[PDB]
C-alpha cells in the first residue's frame, strides 16, 4: 500500500520524508535540528525541511519544538519564513518519535552572500529595509527573535529576504530562557544573560549586520561575554548605573572599573565608506540604553529609507499567546498535542 514516505540516509542519518519531497541536499546543523533542501514534486518549488533533534527527549525539549512550530504557523509576512507543512513518518502516536517542519528555501543567505563578496553596495538599503519590514511584523506579534545573524537572513535570485530560525524566539513579555550561542550580533542584555529584555535586542543585531555588510568586517569580536562587552564600550563609551550597579558580580564590576577609560568613537571613522545617513541610522540602532534604541518602525521611518517611497501603512497582526504552551503537560501529553498539529497538516 502506497506508504506516503521514503527513507534516505543523509550525512549518515536516516531522513523519512513525504514522497512529494525529492532530492534531499543537506544545508545546515543546529542545536535543535538539521536542515535539508528538497524539490516539491507537485510544484517544482525549492523547499527546506528541518528534522528536529530528538524533540521528545524531555518535557521541555517537546515544549520548545511545539513553541517553534506554533510560532512559524502564527507568522504570515513576505519577509518572515513561514510553515508550509509539518509531518512524521511514524504511523501511530505510540511510535511518534520524530517530526519535520517544511519552509520555503530562498536559495542562499547573507553571509554566504558576503563571504563570496557578491553583496552589491546598491542592494544594502533594500536588504536592511526587508529585515526591518520583517522585524516590524515579528515584534507586532509581540515576539523577540533573539538570534538575528547573516546565516538567518535567506535571500533569493531577486534580492528578496526572509528572517529564518525561530528556535530561540520567545514571547516578548515572557522569560528569556534558552542560551544564545551566536556571539557577534547579540545586544548587551543578551550578553548580560538577563531573564527579561525587549524587542530592541533584535534592532541591536540589525545594526551589527548592516555595519558588517557595508565594511565587510564583523563590528564586534570578543572571546567571552565580558570581553564582547569591553569591545562594545570601545565603540559606544562607558555608562554610569551599570559598572557600579547591575553586573550582579564583583569580579566583573572590578574589571570594568579598572580599565583604560576612552569614549564613543565616531561611527564615520569605523564605517569609512558609509552614507552619512547610514552612519546616522547605525548610531540610533547601536545605543546601550535599550529604551533609547530606535524600534523596527522608528528605523523604517528614518531618512536612510526615504528613497523607498513606500509609506505602506502598519500591517496589523495578532499578538502570539504564551498561555497555551505554558500549560503543564507530561511527555505523553506533549506527544498528543504535537500529533494533533501534524494531523491538522495532512495534505
From Swiss-Prot:
The modification Phosphotyrosine is found at residue 179. It catalyses: L-seryl-[protein] + ATP = O-phospho-L-seryl-[protein] + ADP + H(+); L-threonyl-[protein] + ATP = O-phospho-L-threonyl-[protein] + ADP + H(+). Its main location: cytoplasm. One of its GO terms (cellular component) is nucleus. The modification Phosphothreonine is found at residue 177. Residues 21-305 form the Protein kinase domain. Induction: Expression of MAPK12 is down-regulation by MAPK14 activation. It is linked to MAPK is overexpressed in highly metastatic breast cancer cell lines and its expression is preferentially associated with basal-like and metastatic phenotypes of breast tumor samples. This is Mitogen-activated protein kinase 12. It comes from Homo sapiens. The gene is MAPK12.
